[PDB]
Design a protein around this ligand. Sequence first.
Ligand SMILES: Nc1ncnc2c1ncn2[C@@H]1O[C@H](CN(CC[C@H](N)C(=O)O)Cc2ccc(F)cc2)[C@@H](O)[C@H]1O
Ligand SMILES: [Cl-]
Ligand SMILES: [Cl-]
Ligand SMILES: [Cl-]
Ligand code: NA
Length: 262
Amino acid sequence: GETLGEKWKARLNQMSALEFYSYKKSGITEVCREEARRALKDGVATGGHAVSRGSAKLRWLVERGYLQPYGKVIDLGCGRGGWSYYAATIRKVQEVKGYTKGGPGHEEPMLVQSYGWNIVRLKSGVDVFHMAAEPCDTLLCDIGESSSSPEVEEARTLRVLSMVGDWLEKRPGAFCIKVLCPYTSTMMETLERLQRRYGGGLVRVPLSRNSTHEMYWVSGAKSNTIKSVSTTSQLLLGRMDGPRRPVKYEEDVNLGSGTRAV
Ligand SMILES: Nc1ncnc2c1ncn2[C@@H]1O[C@H](CN(CC[C@H](N)C(=O)O)Cc2ccc(F)cc2)[C@@H](O)[C@H]1O
Ligand SMILES: [Cl-]
Ligand SMILES: [Cl-]
Ligand SMILES: [Cl-]
Ligand code: NA
């Protein structure tokens, strides 16, 4: 039986360019990035700006208690560093190590001086699938590239989750892991097994675009896998009908400036 998410994906692939353009942000939550983009383009490192939209996504989770970062944070797939720099502002966090592949077509770490920047070490040139897991207190991972093929998205998600398992075996107390494809029958079974083994639960972040079914597996959630995924599928399906709905806005995160004592 085709799941609601698989029905959503088939409809998404049937949309014309114009339908997709109007659908992808219909009714979502967004931060306005115009000020940060201008400041970062002008080389301003001290204005508090987030380096990417990722800081707002992690903020949404942390402010609601979906995880409580602390201690040594490892950020797999850090990109420019939006999760790493947000984590560095958190009182209980004491060290942030981000790893990202970089190279052609992939974002490099951005060096800025938001609050806590001196406890952040971002390393490019690192493929985390070839990296030995190391102990940490908080494990973050934001890897997963969209594909028009749900079979490709499932294969990519299984690859991420297999890799993350090696890190979870070190028993971090807090975690946030992107799940690109939660919506196939096989994926829901896999995620249920992983929740039984490592805990946590799935949450949909409302800053995600309607064009992806990504959910985050986070240590502070506790929810039925099938219900949480199906509720998201129905939400995304419902937004395909009717008029385009307005975007809702937070102000972009401001991460301040200055160093931290450690
Ligand atoms: N195997 C990999 N090893 C290391 N880094 C990788 C690997 N595969 C992908 N990446 C990089 O992961 C980043 C994913 N970003 C992270 C955003 C970050 N949390 C922030 O807040 O700035 C999200 C993402 C972007 C594009 C996309 F298509 C899928 C995910 C990227 O920089 C990858 O190069
Ligand atoms: Cl990715
Ligand atoms: Cl991927
Ligand atoms: Cl929950
Ligand atoms: Na690059």
